Amino acid sequence: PITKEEKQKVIQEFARFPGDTGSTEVQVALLTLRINRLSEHLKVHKKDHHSHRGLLMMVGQRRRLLRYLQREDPERYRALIEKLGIR
Amino acid sequence: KAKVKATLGEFDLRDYRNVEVLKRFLSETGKILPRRRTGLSAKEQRILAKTIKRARILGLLPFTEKLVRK
């Protein structure tokens, strides 16, 4: 799955500063990893429909945070998207 | 009548391998007793059910037995 080892590796990479656990950049980073953990789980197991629902809620939440970042500071949005290869 | 947990020690509820204690929770048949006769709690009985089923597959507890009466 997703262990706390791999978890901290992402938080410290996208932290705006030491100790930051809840920045918009960090949330989108964390959300996007479970996106890829699930989308690669759904390439196989195409008949797993109940897990398909949780994926739609993660994308909606990821785009909800990105649409917010767009409005406040558009630069860090581009620095984030280019760093995650989205859109 | 007495209840099983009442007359018993401090035991591992997740140990499927201890037949001696698991034989106490089976009836005359291989059936699993209701909570009323075991004196267990909600979460306890749910663990016992699964651990007995484990012992059944290992051939340690019987699936069913024969009643000697009537």
Partner: protein, 116 residues
């Protein structure tokens, strides 16, 4: 022509009939009777009187082969399932033990419309 003198007796009691088989301790039968072996023909077979007479017919048949000790096995519920047991203890055959082995499935086969 066997001289068994000990063995098992299976009572298969249904609501339409009660039937008794007498076997040796290995399970292989010796003689047997039922509600139809005695004169009864129709619904009269699943009655406690027929169950009693069928049990006692097999018992006397087992006396020919010399049965004395008898272990009793019972399968199914039916009118006269108990009247067959009671008939067997007083049949002269010393009854060793009585066991109920009625097979109960683990919900594996779909029953007929009657049973649902």
């Amino acid at each position: 022509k066997r001289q068994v003198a000990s063995g098992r007796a299976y009572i298969h009691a249904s609501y339409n009939n009660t039937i008794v088989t007498i076997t040796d301790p290995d399970g292989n039968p010796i003689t047997w009777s039922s509600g139809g072996v005695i004169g009864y023909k129709g619904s009269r077979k699943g009655t406690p009187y027929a169950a009693q007479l069928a049990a006692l017919d097999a018992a006397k048949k087992a006396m020919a082969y010399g049965m004395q000790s008898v272990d009793v096995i019972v399968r199914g519920t039916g009118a006269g399932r108990e009247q067959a047991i009671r008939a067997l203890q007083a049949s002269g055959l010393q009854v060793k033990s009585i066991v109920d082995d009625t097979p109960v499935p683990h919900n594996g086969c779909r029953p007929k419309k009657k049973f649902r």
